[PDB]
Amino acid sequence: VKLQIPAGKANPAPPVGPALGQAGVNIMGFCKEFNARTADQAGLIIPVEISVYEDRSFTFITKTPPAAVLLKKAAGIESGSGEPNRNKVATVKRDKVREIAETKMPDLNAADVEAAMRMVEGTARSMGIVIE
Amino acid sequence: NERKKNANKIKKLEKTLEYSENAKEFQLYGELLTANLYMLKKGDKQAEVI
């Protein structure tokens, strides 16, 4: 199961209390496991994949935050472009592309820096942002 | 007229307005059942809630 939670928050029941209440875990127990491991900013957003074995042997990998989050913090948007290719509501740098690479080249999913950038910019145009 | 007229009709709007909300009650509980979507029967009235 994929979760998407801030590094400092815990016990948001309605997100995962379903998602692993059929799995049946301590809501605050596992969310404070999460905060203990990612003892970092609340209000942040970590994607985190939980893998559960048949006997309920749960583990998980926390991962780098979304570029959506990083560039909401950069440009100052809440929603993306209401109409990308018609409205550009946010702007970043090539330097920001490299910052986000160096941030997330572990999580990035093309072996080259330039193909990593191709995918990153596929996402940048997904969310409708221009470059500086 | 039009002044007092619509002043009256619009305080009247507000008067009629204040009564009913009837939304977030049962909204939050629909969220609760979505959360506790594994202890339910189709054939109950009551719930148990946090």
Side-chain angles (χ1 to χ4, degrees), chain A residues 36-54:
Chain A
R37 294 179 184 177
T38 61
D40 206 1
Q41 292 87 16
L44 189 139
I45 294 170
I46 297 170
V48 60
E49 192 276 330
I50 299 163
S51 177
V52 65
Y53 187 73
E54 296 177 353

Side-chain angles (χ1 to χ4, degrees), chain B residues 24-50:
Chain B
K24 77 285 291 180
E25 58 270 17
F26 295 100
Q27 188 275 338
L28 191 280
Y29 303 154
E31 296 182 354
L32 292 179
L33 297 175
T34 303
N36 293 316
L37 192 60
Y38 61 100
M39 297 179 287
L40 302 175
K41 189 260 187 293
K42 183 273 297 294
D44 292 331
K45 292 180 290 300
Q46 304 304 102
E48 184 63 25
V49 158
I50 296 168

Side-chain angles (χ1 to χ4, degrees), chain B residues 6-20:
Chain B
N6 295 114
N8 295 310
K9 276 75 182 169
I10 298 165
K11 68 173 184 61
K12 180 74 178 64
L13 290 173
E14 294 173 352
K15 185 266 289 181
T16 303
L17 182 62
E18 294 103 6
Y19 296 98
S20 296

Side-chain angles (χ1 to χ4, degrees), chain A residues 104-116:
Chain A
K104 299 197 278 184
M105 275 174 76
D107 285 334
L108 291 175
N109 44 4
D112 294 331
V113 175
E114 62 271 19

